[PDB]
């Protein structure tokens, strides 16, 4: 996250921290995600596409730090790693950039709500907030696009939803943004998602509850003029989510 402020998991308790085991045993951070029900975390396909073995991944909930333990955190294996079969990448765009992780503890449990762990609501089919609405994004991604380290403490910031008309201008992104994506940015371009924030939530208030409106996907640079963050538009993927979350 570029700009914004440090926070703790209590302010974004649906945030999931996803790591991969490396052959030979080092473990490194992969991507963020969001807890949408006790057994299910939603994230971005592109995070996993290079390494689709569920076995290599570890998911933490209730975790406020990147490389040290938080009191109340919970560790899960990935029972099911579900990537979107129609994922593709064009020159800029990532299409159908959405993934599901079924989680369970070694003990066989799913997540249990606490001070530091809560689910986030899904929006109703095609129900988004109005353009110009302020939303929040969260992650362990870079604080500057040129950095080589990630911050050790969770960050978050506020961005505003941009109209498709605006985001599709040729000096922004043109046709690379489809109706299955949402753009969001700071009006003065001073804060943004960045590398390492993928899979993380874009959260907006909708019908009086915090709702998962988007998933951090892609963009040109970080916090550059006329280059907003692009997010997978969750409200257009409900059937996919429902189908892949059924028994």
């Amino acid at each position: 996250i570029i700009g914004g402020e440090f926070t703790t998991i209590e302010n974004q308790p649906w945030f999931a921290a996803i790591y991969r085991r490396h052959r030979g045993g080092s473990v490194t951070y992969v991507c963020g995600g969001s807890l949408i029900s006790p057994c299910w975390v939603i994230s971005a396909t592109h995070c996993f596409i290079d390494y689709p073995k569920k076995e290599d991944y570890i998911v933490y909930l209730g975790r406020s730090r990147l490389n040290s333990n938080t009191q109340g955190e919970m560790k899960f294996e990935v029972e099911n790693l579900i990537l979107h079969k129609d994922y593709s990448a064009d020159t800029l765009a990532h299409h159908n950039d959405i993934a599901l992780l079924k989680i369970r503890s070694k003990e066989g449990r799913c997540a249990q709500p606490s001070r530091t762990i809560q689910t986030i609501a899904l929006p109703s089919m095609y129900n988004d907030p109005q353009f110009g609405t302020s939303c929040e994004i969260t992650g362990f991604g870079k604080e500057q696009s040129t950095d080589y380290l990630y911050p050790e403490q969770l960050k978050m910031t506020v961005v505003k939803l941009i109209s498709h008309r605006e985001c599709q201008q040729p000096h922004y992104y043109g046709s690379e943004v489809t109706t299955k994506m949402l753009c969001a940015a700071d009006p003065q371009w001073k804060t943004d998602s960045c590398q390492g924030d993928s899979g993380g939530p874009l959260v907006c208030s909708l019908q009086g509850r915090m709702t998962l409106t988007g998933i951090v996907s892609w963009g040109r640079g970080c916090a550059l003029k006329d280059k907003p963050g692009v997010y997978t538009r969750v409200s257009h993927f409900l059937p996919w989510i429902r189908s892949h979350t059924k028994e």
């Binding site: 971005a44 995070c47 990448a89 020159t91 800029l92 990532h94 590398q195 924030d197 993928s198 996907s217």
Partner: peptide
């Protein structure tokens, strides 16, 4: 790369 544009990928997040």
């Amino acid at each position: 790369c544009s990928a997040f």
